[PDB]
Structures are given as structure tokens and as C-alpha cells.
């Protein structure tokens, strides 16, 4: 079966104002590319080509202008809007008809991932055709997130959203795979005390049915924080260090498409043309002739 993707790139309220007064966070750069390139690249690494992008009513034209219909990158992009920030699960209501009868995967528009064999970690989540797969990652501040509690045997036994007193230091990352059950689970959700349709309520629905796979995302992966000005800066510094050391880019969608064999050498060459005078075009050109393992 096929899996479809959703990037939720909606409003972060006034939290980062005035930096985000003018445009939504996910259109701002992390180092050399718009933030949304990173979760888009994530979906593409998981082998997902049909992708729905959800943003504020103000910002859809801007994502649409940036990304197009995706055909240039061998993707099929569609767009939809979240009128108000009423919770992550709302992605599945807005995205209901896009999903139709397929498998799905939700990625948060402001989450960055890096690590060895990230392709396979996604692939093993993508392969599971029933139930939901999520990731748990050790963090210093688990109160900010969906917290997963494990028993002595390592089995996930509870989930709590932003608990006052967290049960472990393991947080559910912003990457979620679901089967055909998600839409129907989402539609039955009731708004939380914070007025939000909670993604953690969707994930707890699968947990009660014993259908939630919680895979550990090991300490050798970087799940980067874009929630504060400070953490945003750290993410830019982290990506810059990696790219300048290696002469290789992180989350370059044109490169990912090309390695997935969704575009051929001749298309990459055309994509390399408009940016030819800067480092990004120079990078895409160099990928035509170099072997990178």
C-alpha cells in the first residue's frame, strides 16, 4: 500500500513575535534553506511523494510560491489551511479527503532530524501497514512535550501531554506514521482543557488498543529544537558545522529526489541552472558527476 504525507506548518501564535510577526516560522531559513525543506526532506527520505502542506490562511500562497506542485522534484504537492491553531490532530480533519483510504504520516513543519541510517529508521516505520509508529527521544525538558512512560521491560505503558511531573525523560518526536484508523480516531476527539485537538490523544487511542509502536530514537540522532530564538540559532549553527565539514548538505530536496531516482540527471541539471552563481546551484551541479556513498 501507498503512504501519503502531511506537513503541519501552522501558526506558533505570538510566541516568537516580533521575529515571526511578518511571516510564519517554517518559511524562515535554518542556515542555507527554508525550514520546511527539512521536514519535507524527511518525508521524502521515508519514500513519500504525495504530500499535503497545511499552513495559516495568510501563508499558503507563500508555501505554494516556494514549493509549487512538486513536479520539478518528482513530488505531488497539494495545499490546505488551518484557520486557527486548534491542535496538531486537526491535520487529520483538514487532511481527511487528501488521505482518502491510504496510509499516512504526519511531520511537524519546524522539526529537524539528522543521523546515520535515518533512511532505514523511517523505512522500518513506513513498512508497518497496521497500527501507528512514533519515536521517543531523550530530552532535558520533557514537560514541553508528549511524554512516554516505559515499564521495566521497556514497554510503553502511558502517554501524557505536557505533564507537570513527567514520568521519564522520553519525548514523542514530531514524526508520526498511521494506518487507516487515524482519521476516524481524530474525528471522535474532543477538545482538551487547552482547547486543542491533541495528537497525544490520537496516539493514546492506538496505545489502549496495543497498536502503538514506540521506537527509541537513539542518542546518536539529533532531533533539533526550533521552539525558541536560542534553539533556532543552535540549529543553524549545527547544520552549518555539518555542511562546512563535509561539503555535503543536510535536507537538500533536489539531492534526495535524485538519489531516490524520482528525477534523472537531466532534470537535476536544469534545477542547477537558476542558482548556478551561488553555492546551492554549485552543489547541485557537483552532484551530477560525484559519487557519494
Amino acid at each position: 500500500m501507498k503512504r501519503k504525507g502531511i506537513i503541519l506548518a501552522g501558526g506558533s501564535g505570538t510566541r516568537l513575535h516580533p521575529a515571526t510577526l511578518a511571516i510564519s516560522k517554517q518559511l524562515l531559513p535554518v542556515y542555507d534553506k527554508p525550514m520546511i525543506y527539512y521536514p519535507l526532506s524527511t518525508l521524502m527520505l521515508a519514500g513519500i511523494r504525495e504530500i499535503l502542506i497545511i499552513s495559516t490562511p495568510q501563508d499558503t500562497p507563500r508555501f505554494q510560491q516556494l514549493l509549487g506542485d512538486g513536479s520539478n522534484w518528482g513530488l505531488d504537492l497539494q495545499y490546505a489551511v488551518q484557520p486557527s491553531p486548534d491542535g496538531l490532530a486537526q491535520a487529520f480533519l483538514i487532511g481527511e479527503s487528501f488521505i482518502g483510504n491510504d496510509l499516512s504520516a504526519l511531520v511537524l513543519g519546524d522539526n529537524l532530524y539528522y543521523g546515520h541510517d535515518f533512511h532505514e529508521l523511517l523505512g522500518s516505520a513506513s513498512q508497518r501497514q497496521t497500527g501507528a509508529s512514533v519515536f521517543a527521544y531523550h530530552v532535558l525538558d520533557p514537560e514541553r512535550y508528549g511524554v512516554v512512560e516505559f515499564d521495566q521491560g521497556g514497554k510503553a505503558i502511558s502517554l501524557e501531554e505536557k505533564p507537570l511531573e513527567p514520568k521519564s525523560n522520553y519525548a514523542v518526536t514530531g514524526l508520526y506514521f498511521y494506518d487507516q484508523q487515524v482519521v476516524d480516531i481524530a474525528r471522535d476527539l474532543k477538545p482538551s482543557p487547552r482547547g486543542e485537538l491533541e495528537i497525544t490523544d490520537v496516539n493514546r487511542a492506538y496505545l489502549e488498543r496495543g497498536q502503538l509502536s514506540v521506537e527509541i530514537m537513539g542518542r546518536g540522532y539529533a532531533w533539533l529544537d526550533t521552539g525558541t530564538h536560542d534553539s533556532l540559532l543552535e540549529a543553524g549553527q549545527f547544520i552549518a558545522t555539518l555542511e562546512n565539514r563535509q561539503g555535503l548538505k543536510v535536507a537538500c530536496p533536489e539531492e534526495i529526489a535524485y538519489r531516490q531516482k524520482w528525477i534523472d540527471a537531466a532534470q537535476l541539471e536544469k534545477l542547477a541552472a537558476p542558482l548556478a552563481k551561488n553555492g546551492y546551484g554549485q552543489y547541485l551541479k557537483r552532484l551530477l558527476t560525484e559519487t557519494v556513498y
Copy 2:
């Protein structure tokens, strides 16, 4: 028969494709430098020079976004007006585009991607602003002067030549992106012919003032930071730099609300209203603290 204050221009137009793809969805001057939009810094810089009437020049695509962020200036005791530069034809064009805005007044041009920091910056700007005749620029020692307008000095310290992006610079002293002009500038600008790059050059403007003995070049000392936003790397260094100062001090660099409050262009009651819609984030809480604390 006919019978002086200074107006400001911020040029925040198209930085071309140079920083694509990071700048595909928005112009550079709306990207943040740490906790605030880049345009806040040159705006705060004009304000520090005592300038309240300011023209913002941007692309047709991005003007509404600048307008949404900044308004007409009334919240901050300013008057902000808007003009478009449909085609990126060079910095000097600001004066053709801003001709009617300028009228018969003195003026100041600042690049919308330029950040400054340092002690007695107010007084440095004040002395350039008080000089009512001729032009005033600032020379700053940089590693890579080939990237800029470069000023050559003689033994006595007098500026004797200006060159734009010379391959072999005569000194390491670059002209910063901040410029003060008398009433002659618009006319100088109209008589310019495009360079062999298809651009109306600010260096040709400054040379004109120099050839007439009316260019003052003041040194901006090594104790000031004139920060680079020309690359992705330098942009990142710029944010790290502001963050270090702000987290150290508990004070902000280029907070426009604060600067208007200190110039006495808005009062305590007005600052309070400015603080309210941001009361739950660090920026609003900072505006509120300014109401009770004495900061020397």
C-alpha cells in the same frame, strides 16, 4: 521667491538570487537576527540619529509585509512611508525613487541589512547629523575590503580617493552602509550613468562629494561592531553576537519601542499599550520592565 531636519531612507529591496533558496519566500530584511527582524536594526539606527520621517524602499512583492510589521510609525512616534523598487538598479536609485519624499530636506541612507553596535554610537551619529553641508560617511577596518567601497587616506589622515570593490584595495577601510547627505544628493544621483554592472553606484555619489571637498569621512573605531549579513555564515554570526550581548546584559540591541521611549517620542502610557499584546513573551515582558527600571 523662497523663504534643518533630516529624513531617512532604508533600502530593503531585492538582494537578488544570491541567498536563494533561504530567501525565496521572503526578503532578507525580514529574516530575523536573533529575536527581531533584521529591518529593526537599521530602523533603530535612524531613530538613534534622531530621524523620525523615514522611507522604506522594498520590492513590490514584500511591501505589504514590511507595512504589516511596521505600520505608519505612529505607535513608535515616527512617520513611515513606503516606496517600491521594481528592479534592483543600485543603491543610488534610493534618491530617484525617494525624490518627492526628500523634498528640500537633508537626508540619511542606511542599508536595511546592516547592523551596528557600540558605545557612544548616539554621539557618533549625532556629529554626522549636525553637519548640515556636504556628505558624511564612516570608514571601518575590515578583513575583506575588496567587497566594499574602500577609502584611501594620506599621511595626515585626509581621505584622498574612493574605489568600489577594488581587486587591490589601498587600505582595509570600508565605507559602512550608513550615509548622511545635504540637499545636493538628489541632483548628483540624477546625473549618474549606470556602471559596467548595470547599477547606479553610491560610491560614484560619495566621490562627487569628495571631488567638491565636501565629503567628511569619519573613522568608526575598532571598538564598534559593524556586522556582516552578506552570507549565510555571517548571518548566523550576527544572531549569535546579538544573543550574547542580550543574554549577558538583560538589555536589547535595536529595540525600537525602547529607543522611541528614550528619545521621548512616546511616553510611559504609550509604551504600556505597546507591551500588552506581547505580555506573554520575552519581548513584551522587556517593554514592561523598561517602565519601572532606570537604565543608564
Copy 3:
């Protein structure tokens, strides 16, 4: 068979003076711990407990004071000196009697590694009981290093040290595993045009015999640069971002020992005592009661 380790923490000349005028680079911190903790931790992750540390004649007391005989961390540390910086291969001459008849592994004292499943990448190199295993990593500046050339089939066909015109962008990292042949290969080496006993000559010796395994260290690993002031700063910023995000440390030797089960809970507790008032002791204490996957 057993494998023994050598950390070469010798002189970097005047290259970083005056920052390194007072003490050798490998005794300076990267973020929260002395640099040498990182390659030491690397050896320990590869399961190596008997370790020789080589430094300048001036700096051995300082390493000796810092690290002791290792018994507190379940290691067996010995020390030796490199009188002059006459090449990396000299590690095997100085280290000849330490190595005796065993397998060995050399790590450079100023190299930092991070990534998912780094333990297994080392383990698979450590398992090979014959020949030499090295790693190749894509870098922007291959002229600075030992450059490995691959044929269309991906087989390593040449090695050149600091070539004027490098054949690929793949550099041999500062981590090397050898069998019993290394000492004898090293002893027959002749000084290069730069007056150095070249590690690349040792590795080319195994290559000619077809006994050099060149494993790719993928782009999902970070091999960090400590060669310049700028790169040293980047390494500190990179480690700080990882540790503050996760609440977990990179290359904490006490933790690594404890997870390898070379020290028990009661010993970790004693190690946590002197530093109790700072974050490092607080970290070691917290490791007594928390489950970390």
C-alpha cells in the same frame, strides 16, 4: 584475541600558538571535558580497556595526573612519550613493547566522533582479526588528509597523503585498527619528504597486500575538526547543542565504563562524589537511577 589501544596525543607544533603555547591541545576542553576524553571514550566504546597514551615529554605528567592508571574507570592505562613530532606511525615504534603480540587500534588524540550505532561500527572493525580497518569520510577539504580513491565498483585502489590534486573527497579518519603486522610494517618505514613516518604508508602497505578494509563512515556521522581555532569552537558548540537538547553527555568515560559493565553502580557512586556540586557529578549520580536506551 585481545585488542590494545593507543591514543596519540603529541605535539601540533606552533600551529595554534599562542593558545597552545602553555599546554598541549589534547588537554584543553571541548565544551565540558578535556579533549582527550573523546578519543579515550572512542576506544572504550570499541571495548578496549588496555590503553597507551603517548604525549610530549612536557605533557605526560599532566595526562598522568588527569587520567591515573585507569583503575577507577575499569581501564588499564600506561604512558609513553614522543620526543619530537616525526609522524603518526611512530606510535607503533614507541608502542611496540606495549602492543607485544596483540591486536591494536590507534586513535588520534584530537579527533571527535558522534553518531548512531557508533558502537557497532567500531565493533565490526574490532572483530576483524586479520588485516587493517580504516574509515573514509566525505569532507570539503581532502588535501588536508589521507585521501582514498575508489573504483567504479567502490573498491579502494589508492591512498595519497595530502595530495596537491586529491582523487576523491574521501579522507581517512583518525581511527585505525591493525593486526599483528603493524609494528613490523612501521619498523621498515623510511621517513617521508616531510621527514615523517607516515601512517598513510602503513595503510598503503596493507592495501598492496589487499589487506586494507576501507569502510565508509556515512554522512550521518559527525567527525569533527579540531585543526584550527575556528573548528575547535565549532566542536564545542556542536557538543553543547547535543548535550543541552538531550540532557545526555557525549564521550563521558565514567558513563561508558558503567554501561560496558566495567564498573558497578557502587563505583560510579564514588566517582560521582567529588564533583557532586557541579553538573558533571550531578550527571553521574542521575545515571545510577535512570534507564537510558
Copy 4:
């Protein structure tokens, strides 16, 4: 019957176990801040104040390493002497340990882990150094004044109290780690009794001057950077900050060779000799460039 220049002290002793294990093998003041040892910055700071006779106070373990780095000062036109602090008994102890070094002279105490940057810093130091009677300190607005000596001001700006690490600070104005004293300091220091932390407090010393009407507290403006080296995080921010300024400018912060050359304590011939053993790295190449270039 008996019948004024100023001596300097740098305290670069034990920072305890606080930054262990990073500081297990060497003391903090020899860790680099970017391209140079931390001790270079306070050393350059004393030099900028015109002080040439300087006592370095370190642990018995690390004195030889300070001596190996710095020598007797003769290469840089200074005279450097050494003393040990066997036990970390508090900052004021510098004056008991440095009593014979000081003699009948004025003095200046600087913390060996403190970095300063900004425009007309020379003149700010000059005005503190010229005041021959009483003591001089600097107050700087910080986010976390609870960590420092905190000065309270009245409506007219007069300093009226000093508190060491108060839980509820009276202002955000911290006393920086740079202190100028007349001849009374040693005696004040000898009469101090240890605090309820087992330490001889510089704040008790400064309070003594204040209780006598002889403490001048000058504001160090927000346009100066007074950088934090108290944590691993702030140390990293410190190096990022120097690197940004130096890579921007093609000039160094706190290069002692340069500062002595500019004070005229060494001449061109001497600077050249200093440049030679480092001719192949960036630091030596920088010393050589200083011989031919005019830097304003």
C-alpha cells in the same frame, strides 16, 4: 622622614572544582578564548590602562606555566612578577599576597578570567587611573546581578549601597572585575575578617571606600561588552564573540604585542623579532602586518 604610577595585579588562581573536569589538567586562565590564552585579555586590559608593572597570582601548581607563556615581560616592554596563592581564600587576599609588590604605590586589580571590549575603553580606563585618591570601580547592567557585587543608586545617580550576591538585587548593576585603588587598600585588606563562606571579600573592601566617601562608581555603558566566563556555556559564547569581531575586522582583541607597540613600549625592530617564531601561523603574520599598516 619620607620625601604617581600604578602597579597591577591579575588574580588567576584556583577556580576550585567548579569547572571540573575541563579544568582538571590546567587552570582556567590558560584556557583559550578563541585564538589566545584567557590571561591575555586581562593582561591587555592592564596594559591599556598604562600599567607596566604587574603581579600575576596563580596556584603553586600552575605558576611555571604562566611563567613559560609570559616570561618576565621584557619582550613586551613590561615587568612581570609572580606570587602564589596556595589556598583560594578570596579576591581581597591579592593585597596581602601582593603587599611587598605594591609598596607605597597605587594599584589595580583585575580578574584573570574577565574580558572587556568597546570603544574608547582606553579613555574609560584612563579616567579611572588618573583619580589618585580613593577607589574606582565599574557598574555594568547584567541579567543576573545575584551572581555579583551589586550597586544601588539613589535618584541623583549616587552609589548608596553595595551588596555581595544578594538574593533580591537592588538594581541590575554589577561591579565588573576591574578595580583601581590608592595606598589605603592594603590596610583595609589586612583588617578584613573572613565572610560566612570562608573568604576575604572585595565587596567589603569597596564598601570601606564607600563608607569613607571615596568610592567612585562609573557606569560601563551597554555599548561595552563585559563577557562572562563563569560557565562552559558562557566560555563558548566568549570565544564565538571574539572570533566574530576578529574575522570581521582583520584586527585582534587583546593582542599584547600590538598594545605594547601602540603604547610605544616596544619599537618596530622589537615587534619584528616577536613576529619571527610565529611567522607561519596567523598570529605571527598579524604581528608583521602591524609594522606597515596604519590602523586608526
